[PDB]
């Protein structure tokens, strides 16, 4: 609904959204419920890979809530997805980033948007915020 308006806005503005997402790199992630089988489209920020053209990182942050978001399980279950980035739409392979690599990519995101550091303080001792790599195929 809201979700719907953010998606229309993304698509009207070359892959950009205002409000809380003003100036941020956005992606619309098409995923499918690992239990329901139902398609959904979730807009979110990404961080582009500094090492590999065609790879973006997304953050299963869910505003520092207690649980991982449903899209996280949907993506890692399917192993592949479709995304809209910029004016494009393409298939992606999904892999989860872990260890010191996760920490480094999360630190760059939190550097650019320090709200991300608050999410991690909110989830301390509860969950580690997953980072996924979406790689263009």
Residue numbers in the entry: 6 to 142
Study text:
The three most active enzymes were from the FDR-A family (MSMEG_5998, 2850 and 3356). To gain further insight into the function of these newly identified enzymes, crystal structures of members of the FDR-A (MSMEG_3356) and FDR-B families (MSMEG_3380) were solved to 2.0 and 1.2 Å resolution respectively. MSMEG_3356 and MSMEG_3380 both adopt the PNPOx-like split barrel fold, comprising a central split barrel surrounded by four helices. MSMEG_3380 exists as a homodimer, while MSMEG_3356 is monomeric. Thus, it appears that MSMEG_3356 is the first characterized structure of a member of the FDR-A family. Despite their low similarity, the structures of both the FDRs described here are characterized by large hydrophobic pockets formed by several aromatic residues and a positively charged groove that is principally formed by several lysine and arginine side-chains. In terms of shape and electrostatic character, these pockets/channels are highly complementary to the F420H2 cofactor, which possesses an aromatic deazaflavin group and a long, negatively charged, side-chain consisting of a phospho-lactate and a variable number of glutamates. Consistent with the level of electrostatic and hydrophobic interactions implied by the docking results, titration curves of activity versus cofactor concentration show that both MSMEG_3356 and MSMEG_3380 bind F420H2 tightly, with apparent KM values in the nanomolar range (260 nM and 130 nM, respectively). In MSMEG_3356, the deazaflavin/substrate pocket is formed by W7, N25, F26, M31, P48, M49, M50, F64, A68, W76, F121 and Y124, and the positively charged groove is formed by the side-chains of N8, H36, R39, K40, T41, K43, T47 and K67. Also, the MSMEG_3380 cavity is significantly larger than that of MSMEG_3356 (649 Å3 versus 411 Å3).
